[PDB]
Design a protein around this ligand. Sequence first.
Ligand SMILES: O=C1N[C@H]2NC(=O)N[C@H]2N1
Ligand SMILES: O=C1N[C@H]2NC(=O)N[C@H]2N1
Ligand SMILES: O=C1N[C@H]2NC(=O)N[C@H]2N1
Ligand SMILES: O=C1N[C@H]2NC(=O)N[C@H]2N1
Lengths: 123, 123, 123, 123
Amino acid sequence: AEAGITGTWYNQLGSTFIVTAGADGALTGTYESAVGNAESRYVLTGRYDSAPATDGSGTALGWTVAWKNNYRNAHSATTWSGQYVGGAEARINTQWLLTSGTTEANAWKSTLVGHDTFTKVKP
Amino acid sequence: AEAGITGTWYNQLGSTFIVTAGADGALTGTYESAVGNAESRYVLTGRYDSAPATDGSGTALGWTVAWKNNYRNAHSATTWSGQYVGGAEARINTQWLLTSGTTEANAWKSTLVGHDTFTKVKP
Amino acid sequence: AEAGITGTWYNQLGSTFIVTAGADGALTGTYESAVGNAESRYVLTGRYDSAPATDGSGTALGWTVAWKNNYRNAHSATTWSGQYVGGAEARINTQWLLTSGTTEANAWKSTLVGHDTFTKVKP
Amino acid sequence: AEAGITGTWYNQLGSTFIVTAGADGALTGTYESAVGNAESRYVLTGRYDSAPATDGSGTALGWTVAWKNNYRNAHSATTWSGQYVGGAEARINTQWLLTSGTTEANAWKSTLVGHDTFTKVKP
Ligand SMILES: O=C1N[C@H]2NC(=O)N[C@H]2N1
Ligand SMILES: O=C1N[C@H]2NC(=O)N[C@H]2N1
Ligand SMILES: O=C1N[C@H]2NC(=O)N[C@H]2N1
Ligand SMILES: O=C1N[C@H]2NC(=O)N[C@H]2N1
């Protein structure tokens, strides 16, 4: 976990995120998306539960990125929830929620759901 | 947004979270759950997209909490994705993902999904 | 369950669905939405798990509706997954997935997620 | 679509489902899971939106399976929402919701979410 988490990861879409897992459960870094209404790097902050594991389980973790930087303001934020698995072929398997700011009338369709798998190798 | 977000919020289950929305999109605070394998307060970090809004839209935001503190280690993390609506009856409407650390064999059932609505009044 | 499920239900948005729970786990009926790219009634088919319950649990069930009829073809389908609770104030609590037909390029944003609560009374 | 949908499909976990897409949007068949609290075949019913597509889009569809047959009664149901893509390497990409019957107290953790990809070849 923690050490194993620190570094650069890439997913199936071609996004990249560089994160640092600090000693007490914090995750800090940047996310650069390949698709969407995103452009350049965005700031990401999150948490992981280590003290994870005498039965080779993954470490649970999650992070958030608001799609606003000095080039684009997409009026939305995405949160990724999943677990890290270390080893030869370490990966982070997640499911994500992307919510857009809407009017109360279209709030019912404000969130998209999907999944991403990240590897230390691209892809 | 930001100012409107800062403060104490409560949801339908009885949880409470106190957050501070910093000038550049950061959310920091603590979460105390009423249900679950949680006990006391946990640290939460997240982000919001303001610069939100000439058509009364909500501000998109999200946060993460790892369920580990000095009393309990649940080996899991939850991320909430949603939007803030200010006004007389301001609220944050979210959908959440709770992932548990599992073995590769039970990873397919590692995540629960649900929804929570927070108000400045309880509830 | 089954008997208790048969009838007309209404949700928070104002949609209505009339369903018949057949003896062996089948659900058949029509759905009329209030929001969306829907217009009139659409056909719905689904299943429930009864033989549900010596500890007052809800009955698990789910259904699907494709948003095509003789007035509109929205190129999408929604599935609702949840449980029925009977009693004075019986209700069906669900979470739903709405998927739209897209090109491989926008498949990552093809699904919206949300939740609906149905009562025998409107609302 | 429809014709292309009819047949036997397999997913990443090793489950199999045989379905028949009828002329007017109905899907009928059986599902046999490889993981879970399932054993043998279960009945599945659902719908698809064809009249799908001058821009090579997928056809939206969804189905439900209640995990009860003459060998097991898991007190739960799963709904799959996604789209079919035909061609050399045709597939159905979905996201699913699995809800279990619980007491009102544990209803907040009654649903798991995940994703499955089905191919005509295993896997
Ligand atoms: O990397 C990305 N994954 C997907 N989810 C999301 O929020 N934007 C897309 N980009
Ligand atoms: O406040 C809470 N909401 C629910 N989601 C979650 O992660 N734990 C439960 N507690
Ligand atoms: O009744 C409805 N609920 C929402 N989900 C959906 O698919 N369309 C909307 N209509
Ligand atoms: O085929 C399966 N996919 C997963 N989702 C589900 O409901 N059970 C598991 N089996």
